[PDB]
Amino acid sequence: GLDISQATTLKATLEDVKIDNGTVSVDIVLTNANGVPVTGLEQYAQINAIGLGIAKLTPESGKGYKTPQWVSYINSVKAADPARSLANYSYTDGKDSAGNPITKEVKFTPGDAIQANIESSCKTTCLTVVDSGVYRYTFQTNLSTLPAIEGLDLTYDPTLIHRITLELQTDGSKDAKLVNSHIDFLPSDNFRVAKETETRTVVDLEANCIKCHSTNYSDTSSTAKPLALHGGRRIGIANCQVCHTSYSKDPETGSPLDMGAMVHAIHKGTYAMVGYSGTAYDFSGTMAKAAAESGYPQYREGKDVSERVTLPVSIGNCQSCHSTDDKGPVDAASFKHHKGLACASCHMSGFNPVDNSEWLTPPEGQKDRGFVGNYFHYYATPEIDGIPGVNLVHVFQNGGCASCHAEQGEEGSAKYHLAKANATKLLRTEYAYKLENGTFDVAKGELTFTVNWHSDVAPHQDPKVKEFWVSLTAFNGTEYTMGPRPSNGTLGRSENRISVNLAKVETNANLTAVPNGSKVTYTLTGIKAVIGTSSVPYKQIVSIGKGFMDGKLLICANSAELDPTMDAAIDCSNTEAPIYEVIVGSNKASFSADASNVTARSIVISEAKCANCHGEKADFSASHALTHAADKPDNSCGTCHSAVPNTAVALADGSCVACHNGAPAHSKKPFERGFDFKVMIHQIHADTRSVRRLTTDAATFPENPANCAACHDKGQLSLATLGNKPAFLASTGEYSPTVAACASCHATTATDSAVIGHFETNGGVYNAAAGTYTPGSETCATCHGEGKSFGVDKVHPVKY
């Protein structure tokens, strides 16, 4: 074998568990990455951790099926530190309908609490060498003589599945010589390993979490953000599950440490607790707000962390974390079954049995179902629920018990939770359409194009179609440029873009529709511009004469239809149930003088990678809420500003760059919060944007922003033509294209004259007078293109 002092990697597996009159042992099989036994562990002076846990999987009972839950054998009752037991606080947030300020209250319930834990302090004292690289760990903890803990059943039951976990770390290693392992087994059958179907998994790191989270544990960069907890030693889900049990709490706050309640509340931005060394972790950001507004002496800037989690999907998007495609854990369907803490962790945010003690008592002559049960059955309202507008009691009264209480194989509350996502997919398939290329007779000012629609009931004839936008944008073959803001025109107020609502043909004097079965041919007139030095509507559409067309169809859907075998689409004018909008995009068609294709804009990011975090086909109309959001995209200021809807769909095909490019029109922002798409997106996700329009909170990006592969595919960053693009002209001056791309992280202002000088030495311009840069002048690609001497793929912590 190889001495641990010289082993550069560790791997470990657990086997041959033995439990005898309460005495537990397991073998740790330790090797390096090439499978050579690693010897010397039991004498090594550089061990950071050898922690072993053990838990039993215990059944749960109630109405319907309830999933089994882990009970650790190893626990203690933790006292609260008095100084760090968080006081309640309140803070202002917005105004009510009469214009008066709204105050919100945050409440805690500090007090003694149980916490599950593992055996960590024994380490080599509990080791015996059984073979080369095979170390038997015999627990100090005897299962027969565990201290009684009130309300916890710690009896050893060999007929239950058990789990033993290992955390092993040497040499301060974040990865190479860190391991989390476990083994799940059945003592009553000779301690054999458990089948996947016998044990409890629920979520899987790869299937359910890495879509957002970095797992680059070794990342040495300044912006590293791997999902590694408790100083870095804890990385494996199975290890979390032994301590993060249903009964474990933080005594400083009363907050649940249950894996599900904790993870839901973290990602909802409601969780707050005090952890190791008395550090407060407030995932809402509201503690810092109260401290600044009112004073809150327990919040210590620079030590405690109070930041609002910014989740890139809705907290209702269960499928971001819970597999429904049978490619995740075999018990993935566990999220369909009621469990008090799980259901509470979204619907009962901020409530507790002290401050809401009335809910401990059910209404006269109804059965007591406990605190959470009584809320769901009796006391919930839309006005107070953790999910605004949700009416759980209406479901109790009118929806039938199986709406929440599910036998194995049934959907339970997932009938409600997944209803809109499911109907959305079906409606996008039903209403799918294709845009054929446009013929633009520029002298006549007329564009003709045919939509291949899903049926012979045309868009304007279908009252389920709310609007059907097609937007045309001029593209000169090099890059989009929004250009200056013109005076208003009949069709819009942009030089390079027109958005037309095909659903309102009959009241639009500039639009005619001629059907031919399921094909509808539209003719849009009045696309005329006097071309000179002045800005006028459609100036670039006319001068260039070609570009692209993008569809954004809005369908009305019925929130009250929960039966997937029924039609979810509904007449937009219906007033009996709430309607939600389903968005259906399209191919990006060309328009040109003869309807020939216009060569596509290069693709330099990955659609699928944006969707890893934001989910499939994320909508960004709400991102356009700040300014002239209510103005329609065919009407004056709304041509650019609309949020009703924003008229782009796809993220990686230049649809957004139609506007977000180097030439924002007016009222311009400076570079450090620039409009150009690459600048803006880099800044948001790297937290280098000086000000975000709609929030004071920086994005909490769950990857490393310097991991370019989070958004870019290999080969997309040659930089070979980037210098040929026009400069980005911000408020104060312009920035050449590669300079803009890199400075958006590296130099948002001229704080470091060596960095700025480096740009300028190599053909770049930084905050220069408009017109300074000549396309072709940057020489960056020669050194920084992928694979080159200082290639972007070499100098950044990428994970392709």
Which residues of this protein are in contact with Mg ion, per CB under 5 A? Answer: 505, 508, 511, 624, 627, 629, 641
Tell me: is residue 126 an annotated ligand-binding position: no
Of 119, 250, 676, 778, the one binding Ca ion by CB under 5 A: 250
Least distance from Mg ion to the Cβ atom of residue 501, Å: 11
Which residue, among 592, 619, 589, has the nearest Cα to 452 in the 3D structure?
589
Nearest partner of 522 among 469, 474, 574, judged by Cα: 469
User: Based on CB atoms, which residue is closest to ligand HEC, 554 or 792?
Assistant: 792
Tally of residues, the chain? 800
Q: How far is the CB of 37 from ligand HEC (least distance, A)?
A: 26
In contact, 736 and 765? CB cutoff 8 Å: yes
The answer to whether 319 and 424 are in contact (CB under 8 A) is: no
Chosen from Mg ion, ligand HEC, Ca ion, none, partner binding at 666 (C-beta under 5 to 8 Å by type) = ligand HEC
CA distance 653 to 434: 16
Query: Which residues in 749-768 contact ligand HEC (CB under 6 A)?
Result: 755, 758-759, 762-764
Contact of residue 675 among ligand HEC, Mg ion, Ca ion, none (CB under 5-8 Å per partner type):
ligand HEC
d(CA 472, CA 442): 14
Ranges within 510-539 binding ligand HEC (CB under 6 A): none
Residue found by looking up tokens 């036994």 in the block: 37
Token reading at 530: 């006097």
Residue 558 binds what, of ligand HEC, Ca ion, Mg ion, none (CB under 5 to 8 Å, by partner type)? none
Residue from the set 511, 644, 711, 768 that interacts with ligand HEC by CB under 6 A: 711
Q: Which of 17, 30, 41, 203 binds ligand HEC (CB under 6 A)?
A: 203
Q: How far apart are CA 106 and CA 18, in angstroms?
A: 48
Q: How far is the CB of 282 from Mg ion (least distance, A)?
A: 31
At residue 676, the 3 state secondary structure works out as coil
Stretch near ligand HEC under the rule CB under 6 A, chosen from 8-16, 42-50, 293-301, 672-680: 672-680
Q: Least CB distance from residue 473 to Mg ion, whole Å?
A: 18
Query: Which of positions 398-457 make contact with ligand HEC (CB under 6 A)?
Result: 399, 401, 403-405, 413, 416-417, 419-420
Q: Choosing among ligand HEC, Mg ion, Ca ion, none, which partner's interface includes residue 485 (Cβ < 5 to 8 Å by kind)?
A: ligand HEC
Residue 501 neighbours by CB under 8 Å, 6+ apart: 467, 468, 469, 508, 632, 634
98 C-beta neighbours (distance < 10 Å), count: 5
CB under 5 to 8 A by kind: which of ligand HEC, Ca ion, Mg ion, none does 306 bind?
A: none
Query: Which residues in the 574-633 window bind ligand HEC by CB under 6 A?
Result: 604-605, 609-610, 612-614, 620, 623-624, 626-629
List the interface residues with ligand HEC, window 28-47 (CB under 6 A): none
Q: What is the DSSP string of 71-97?
A: EES-EEEEPPPSTTSPPPEEEEEEE-T
Indicate the residue among 500 and 711 with the shorter CB distance to Mg ion.
500
Query: Which one of 52, 706, 729, 768 is in contact with ligand HEC (CB under 6 A)?
Result: 706
Q: Are strands 178-186 and 579-584 parallel, antiparallel or unpaired?
A: unpaired
As measured in angstroms, the least distance from the Cβ of 612 to Ca ion is: 33
Distance (Å) of CA 342 to CA 67, 316, 346: 12, 13, 7
Question: What is the 3-class SS of 326-382, one letter each residue?
Answer: CCCCCCHHHHHCCCHHHHHHHHCCCCCCCCCHHHHCCCCCCCCCHHHHHHHHHHCCC
**Site for ligand HEC contains 169 (CB under 6 A):** no
Q: Report the residue from 288, 392, 542, 584 that binds ligand HEC according to the rule CB under 6 A.
A: 392
Q: Which is nearer to ligand HEC, 30 or 315 (CB)?
A: 315
* Secondary structure of residue 519 in the 3-state scheme: strand
Sheet holding 162-170: strands in order across? 66-72, 47-60, 162-170, 178-186, 192-193
Q: Which does 762 bind (CB under 5 to 8 A by kind): Mg ion, Ca ion, ligand HEC, none?
A: ligand HEC
Residue 421, SS3 per DSSP: helix
Written as one string, the DSSP assignment of 35-75 is: --BEE-GGG-TTEEEEEEEEEEEEEE-SSS-EEEEEEES-E
Is residue 734 a contact point for Ca ion (CB under 5 A)? no
Q: Does 508 carry a binding-site annotation? A: yes
Of the candidate residues 355, 396, 422, 490, the single one contacting ligand HEC (CB under 6 A): 396
Q: β-pairing, 465-474 with 11-20? A: unpaired
Which residue matches tokens 């760990």?
137
* Continuous segment of H or E residues that includes residue 450: strand 446-452
Instruction: Determine, following the binding rule CB under 6 A, whether residue 173 of this chain makes contact with ligand HEC.
Output: no
Strands 38-39 vs 2-3: parallel, antiparallel or unpaired:
parallel
- Helix axes of 340-347 and 259-268: crossing angle, nearest 10 degrees: 10
- 394 marked as binding residue: no
Judged by CB under 5 A, the residue of 252, 331, 495, 793 near Ca ion is 252
The closest alpha carbon to 671, from 745, 778, 755, belongs to 745
Q: How far is the CB of 146 from ligand HEC (least distance, A)?
A: 17
For the stretch 456-485, what's the b/e string if a residue is b when 16 or more beta carbons lie within 10 angstroms of its beta carbon?
Answer: eebbbebebbbbbbbbbbbbbeebbbbbeb
Site for Ca ion in 258-297 (CB under 5 A): 274
According to the binding rule CB under 6 A, does residue 770 interact with ligand HEC? no
| Residue 270: CB minimum distance to Ca ion, A | 17
Residue placing its CB nearer to ligand HEC in the complex, 462 or 479: 479
Q: How far is the CB of 346 from ligand HEC (least distance, A)?
A: 3
Strand partners, 56: 71, 162
- Smaller CB separation from Mg ion, 511 or 610: 511
For ligand HEC, which residue of 485, 528, 539, 546 counts as binding (CB under 6 A)? 485
- Selection from Mg ion, Ca ion, ligand HEC, none that 508 binds (CB < 5 to 8 A by kind) is Mg ion
**Closest by alpha carbon to 312, among 18, 666, 703?**
703
Smallest gap from residue 502 Cβ to Mg ion (A): 10
> Per CB under 6 A, does 63 bind ligand HEC?
yes
Q: Is 505 annotated as a binding residue?
A: yes
Q: Which is nearer to Ca ion, 274 or 332 (CB)?
A: 274
CB of 187 to ligand HEC, least distance (A): 22
Q: What is the CA radius of gyration of the chain?
A: 30
How far apart (Å, rounded) are the C-alpha atoms in residues 554 and 572? 10
Quick check: 479 binds Ca ion (CB under 5 A)? no
H or E, element range at 17: strand 11-20
Residues 223-252 that bind ligand HEC (CB under 6 A): 223, 225, 229-230, 234-236, 239-241, 243-244, 250
- Residue 200-239 contact track with Ca ion, rule CB under 5 A, x = bound: ----------------------------------------
In 475-571, the DSSP E strands lie at 497-501, 511-516, 519-524, 547-558
Binding residues for Mg(2+): 505, 508, 511, 624, 627, 641
Binding site for Ca ion (CB under 5 A): 250, 252, 274
Binding residues: 63, 66-67, 69, 115, 200, 209, 212-213, 222, 230, 240-241, 243-244, 250, 252, 264, 267, 274, 318, 321-322, 338, 340, 343, 346-347, 377, 391, 401, 404-405, 417, 420, 505, 508, 511, 601, 610, 613-614, 616, 623-624, 627, 637, 640-641, 656, 659-660, 666, 669, 682, 685, 689, 692-693, 708, 711-712, 742, 745-746, 758, 780, 783-784, 790, 796
